[PDB]
Amino acid sequence: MSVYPKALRDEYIMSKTLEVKLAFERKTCKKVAIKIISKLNVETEIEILKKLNHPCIIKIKNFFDAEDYYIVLELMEGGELFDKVVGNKRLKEATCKLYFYQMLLAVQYLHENGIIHRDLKPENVLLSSQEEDCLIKITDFGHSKILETSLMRTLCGTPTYLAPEVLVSVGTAGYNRAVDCWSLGVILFICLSGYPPFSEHRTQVSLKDQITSGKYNFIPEVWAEVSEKALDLVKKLLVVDPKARFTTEEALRHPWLQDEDMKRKFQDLLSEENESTALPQVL
Numbered sequence: 001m002s003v004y005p006k007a008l009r010d011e012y013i014m015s016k017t018l019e020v021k022l023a024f025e026r027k028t029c030k031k032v033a034i035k036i037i038s039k040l041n042v043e044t045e046i047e048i049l050k051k052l053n054h055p056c057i058i059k060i061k062n063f064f065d066a067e068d069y070y071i072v073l074e075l076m077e078g079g080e081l082f083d084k085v086v087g088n089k090r091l092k093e094a095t096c097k098l099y100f101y102q103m104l105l106a107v108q109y110l111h112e113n114g115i116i117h118r119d120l121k122p123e124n125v126l127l128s129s130q131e132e133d134c135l136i137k138i139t140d141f142g143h144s145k146i147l148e149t150s151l152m153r154t155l156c157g158t159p160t161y162l163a164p165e166v167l168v169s170v171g172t173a174g175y176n177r178a179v180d181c182w183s184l185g186v187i188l189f190i191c192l193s194g195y196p197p198f199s200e201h202r203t204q205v206s207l208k209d210q211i212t213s214g215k216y217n218f219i220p221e222v223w224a225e226v227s228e229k230a231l232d233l234v235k236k237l238l239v240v241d242p243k244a245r246f247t248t249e250e251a252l253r254h255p256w257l258q259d260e261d262m263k264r265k266f267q268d269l270l271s272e273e274n275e276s277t278a279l280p281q282v283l
């Protein structure tokens with residue numbers, strides 16, 4: 001086989017898988033998760049992670065640059081959201097709402113901070129516990145981008161020599177963040193129905209053509225169990241035109257998210273997580 005770097009071994013006792021491994025911080029005897037990336041773009045991912053501070057975004061605890069990259073992260077005992085939706089499995093509407101609300105807060109925080117994830121999927125959504133009512137965290141910032149652009153500098157001069165395709169691109173520039181809202185729409189569709197909106201399964205139309213047209217597969221029997229408000233939100237995120245597509249703010253103001261009970265349950269989970277870290281405060 002091979003061995004772990006001495007620097008890692010100095011601080012952690014390595015254990016079983018879920019490349020992610022379980023490890024114990026020697027100083028605290030606390031469980032951690034160690035992400036092993038095969039061997040530079042990882043340094044930017046580290047840089048992004050170190051700067052972000054949100055309860056629905058994964059936190060980096062340590063980093064080791066050796067024969068491979070070792071990323072020490074907070075352990076999520078609930079695993080991936082993928083495991084909850086795989087093989088036609090579906091979540092109860094109330095659970096979709098609690099998880100989705102947190103995904104929206106996380107993505108709104110990202111967008112506010114000039115970061116686009118670009119790889120939102122159930123595999124990149126982690127659950128804090130094996131309980132249905134838990135905290136979620138967004139992970140896998142490898143494909144992420146940082147939002148002055150080259151276009152702004154180009155527009156500052158006279159366009160005597162400027163190409164038409166550049167001037168045409170001014171219409172859509174600054175809408176890259178909308179790709180995350182589309183991904184959230186697909187995640188929400190999957191969570192509610194237990195099936196993907198766009199697939200090659202039992203269809204003639206190509207996966208590409210389904211997406212560009214925005215003609216998702218609607219199965220009435222599956223969706224009758226789901227509320228009209230939840231489906232209305234999906235429809236608003238699954239809008240082909242990125243400029244018309246719902247933003248995280250528009251999604252957060254949607255009737256489906258105006259649920260005081262769901263919001264209370266989230267604030268409750270937050271308080272419970274923070275209970276171990278809370279310092280006495282000035283009264």
Ligand SMILES: C/C(=N\O)c1ccc(O)cc1O
Pocket residue numbers: 018020033035058073074075076077078079080126139140
């Ligand atoms: C930290 C992490 N991913 O980034 C992770 C990965 C898999 C798993 O089951 C639990 C986890 O905490």
